[PDB]
Amino acid sequence: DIISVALKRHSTKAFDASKKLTAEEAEKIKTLLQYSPSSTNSQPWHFIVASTEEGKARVAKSAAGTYVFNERKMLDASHVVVFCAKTAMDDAWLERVVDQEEADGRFNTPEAKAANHKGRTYFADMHRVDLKDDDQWMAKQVYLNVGNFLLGVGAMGLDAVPIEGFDAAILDEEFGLKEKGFTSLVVVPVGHHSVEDFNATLPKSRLPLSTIVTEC
């Protein structure tokens, strides 16, 4: 029951450094990252999936100073996913998206593909040209991916914890994302919580529906 999952999944505060994801689970979390929806199927993202001790150590460089209290989560987890967004929407990327859709058989005619491309470009330009906010627009799609991911891993019976408490400048530099056209937004360690993960047993807390929801 997905509703039970939502009422049960939690932000892991401690991971068992001995429990690793199975090969199948590792394949599945990558599938979750890949198949998340996005505006115009723009998929303005890239993901770093660190599973080796060296890889996790590189990501952990971002848990410096003020963020040092997040270091252990990044080091003890089985797999650590760094969610990155494109820094600018280039035509090259838009072309890749529409060409992939054609390859997957989503268009019944060439005109249909051209129309899809025109439309995606039209909305991309709305952000790139008019609003000048394509960077924030794409970052938003990445957070949506994070939302999809957290519930998905929870539904897999796996533990995870979303992290904004990291130095993105440091992380970007460590992986040369700037030069690749990406920037890190959220770090998500995934694995199995340890017995010491006190947050696994604390009740979930949210504001009441009477405050957050308006029915019409």
Ligand X SMILES: Cc1cc2nc3c(=O)[nH]c(=O)nc-3n(C[C@H](O)[C@H](O)[C@H](O)COP(=O)(O)O)c2cc1C
Q: Which is nearer to ligand X, 177 or 185 (CB)?
A: 185
From CA 189, how far away is CA 12, in angstroms rounded?
Answer: 9
Instruction: Choose one: 53-61, 87-95, 127-135, 161-169; the region binding ligand X (CB under 6 A).
Output: 161-169
Q: Which is nearer to ligand X, 90 or 123 (CB)?
A: 123
Q: How far is CA 25 from CA 75, 152, 153, 159, in A?
A: 19, 11, 9, 12
| Residue numbers 135-154 binding a second copy by CB under 8 A | 136, 139-141, 143-152
At closest approach, how far in Å is the CB of 150 from a second copy?
Answer: 6
Instruction: Choose one: 36-44, 52-60, 151-159, 175-183; the region binding ligand X (CB under 6 A).
Output: 36-44
User: What own/partner pairs with CB < 8 Å and gap ≥ 24 does 52-58 have?
Assistant: 55/80, 56/80, 58/174, 58/175
From CA 175, how far away is CA 59, in angstroms rounded?
Answer: 9
| Residue 145 found at the interface with ligand X (CB under 6 A) | no
Active site residues: 13, 73, 164
With CB under 5 to 8 Å by kind, the binding choice for 60 among a second copy, ligand X, none is: none
Burial class (CB in 10 A: 0-12, 13-18, 19+), 183: buried
Query: CB-hemisphere CA count at 13 Å for 43?
Result: 17
Q: Which is nearer to ligand X, 32 or 163 (CB)?
A: 163
With CB under 5 to 8 Å by kind, the binding choice for 63 among a second copy, ligand X, none is: none
| Residue numbers 54-83 binding a second copy by CB under 8 A | 54-55, 58-59
| Residue 154 found at the interface with ligand X (CB under 6 A) | no
Name 65's Cβ contacts closer than 8 Å, sequence gap at least 6.
167
From CA 65, how far away is CA 179, in angstroms rounded?
Answer: 25
With CB under 5 to 8 Å by kind, the binding choice for 110 among ligand X, a second copy, none is: none
